[model samples]
Target: IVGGYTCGANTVPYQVSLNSGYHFCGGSLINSQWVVSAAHCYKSGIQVRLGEDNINVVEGNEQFISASKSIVHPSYNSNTLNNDIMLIKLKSAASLNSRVASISLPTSCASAGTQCLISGWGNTKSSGTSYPDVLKCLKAPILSDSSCKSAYPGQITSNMFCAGYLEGGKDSCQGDSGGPVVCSGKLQGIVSWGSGCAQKNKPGVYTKVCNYVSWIKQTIASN
Candidate 1:
């Protein structure tokens, strides 16, 4: 997270760290055993850590679990980064508490200009190496489809949307992909990709979560 503030304890209870050893990506817990994240973050032997805040310290509230199963969207296209969403089934259910819980799925699509929150342990600097020990969050506004297209000509698709400052400032940086973009207590998007970290006319792009609500339900129900 660039130009962001450190989140308070239990402020983002649904947020979890992917691959706890390295803390590479962030994901949102949708249920005790299911986590929604970016498909690009998929890798074998990933460990999901629930109730995490400061990765540098051993917070007694943490729940470290291996992934029992990982389902990447069948339509995911790595080259274009389309449909960059994934679901992870934990080896065991996470115990819910004040520091660990699930976030509700989106009930409605977020409209353009809707202010949302993005949190992660990604780089705080766009040009240098700086990762925070504590989770960080940034408030960014969602941009219209047209605005997103104009920002990255011929790249924005129906499954993708843009959020962040067009003039350049705050944004989700590297190692932040697969994190949550939340609005109104709902998971709106999954951090996907962008031209760069907080660059002018190159806002952070995310996988529009609303469009895949049914897919999420069906995937969970059948498997």
Candidate 2:
């Protein structure tokens, strides 16, 4: 597996650990008390780890926050994968620091063609295995509405955005789902799906954070 510098806190990256010792993908810290991840990451026996470097080597300073409640978007449908976003309310708030900082959510996210950052412990190559321990990341330029619509054809929707490398070699894999796609220091998207990681014709799909602003605000307020 290709390795590089580990991600620091305030970067809004995360990992989802499953019951079978399998790790899925990464996510983002939206608040000191809440984490934003993909709804699919809530599968049985999954736990979230934040502010860490290596997945296999846990640091004492890393925060292992348990979800007091996981609020998956009510409209989420497993088959269609619509409304794939979810929020994890931490049992307790985490201490803010460089390695653990919250990302701001965008109020208007549908304009399209925005630049963003995506990070995770996923495979660097399409069809490759996920990284065992180290986290990796890349920069994905957001696609315009027309571009996204053209690329995804029937799959493109208002709730999602697309980003990835056109030449391949850099992208998020199976375990990188639910991670944040940040732009201008704002949390704009959540990793959803694609035909394949970093494929030339396929782009990574993400939940549009801006589109869910009211839902997120109301959910947090009531919770």
Candidate 3:
């Protein structure tokens, strides 16, 4: 995020750097063989890097894995950005250690106003387009669906949610898409989309993870 600060290498172990021969989006490891991210971040040659805090450095612990398959939500619509979530199956399971682990998935929906944690290499400025090399972290407050609707009329949907300040500033921008939105120590949302970086009343919109827990499980089991 534009105003976010540097995060520790071990702070968000589940976080993964999604790349296509280069850094592009962010993601989270949900299990030994699966990753959770946004469908909108999809591209050819997608790969995942775990236990990595900085894209500029070659961490000895980083686990770079090839994707075996990626399943976009059947109902995913890039136009409305509804059901904007997806899953990526790794060619091989990730090795868990101090710096590599899967995140705990939430059993229920996130409540509005709940403070959540997120990290990414997204653009620091909306128009300037400066993405960070060192992963940055920030806190966001879950905005009520009603309020989020007010900010983006006809753009928000039930399958999606918002999180950030209504006053402007602090949000996931370009390059942060598909990253995890962690709340109460569990994975809650995925960085789906946003209007503009840190715009007033335009908090970042996320694909609600709890709403698709069953689908996630079924997808993982089948694929």
* Candidate 1 residue pairs that clash: none
1 or 3, which is superior by lDDT?
Answer: 1
lDDT of candidate 2 over 28-126, digit per residue (tens): 777777788888877544465766776677665477766677888999887767899888888788777766777888866644565677777766656
**Residue 106, model 1, lDDT:** 93
Query: Compared with the true structure, what per-residue lDDT tens digits does model 3 show for residues 1-223?
Result: 8678899776888999998878888898998899999999877677889988778789677889998898899999989989999899999999998789999899999899899998898898856788777889999889998999998999988888999987777888889899999999889999988888898888899999998999999999898
> lDDT values of the candidates?
0.92, 0.71, 0.89
For all candidates, the clash counts are: 0, 5, 0
Maximum-lDDT candidate:
1
Q: Least accurate stretch of 10 residues (summed lDDT) in model 1?
A: 17-26
Off by over 4 Å in 1: none
Off by over 4 Å in 3: none
Q: Cα miss at 132, model 3 (Å)?
A: 1.2
Give the Å error, residue 60, model 3: 1.9
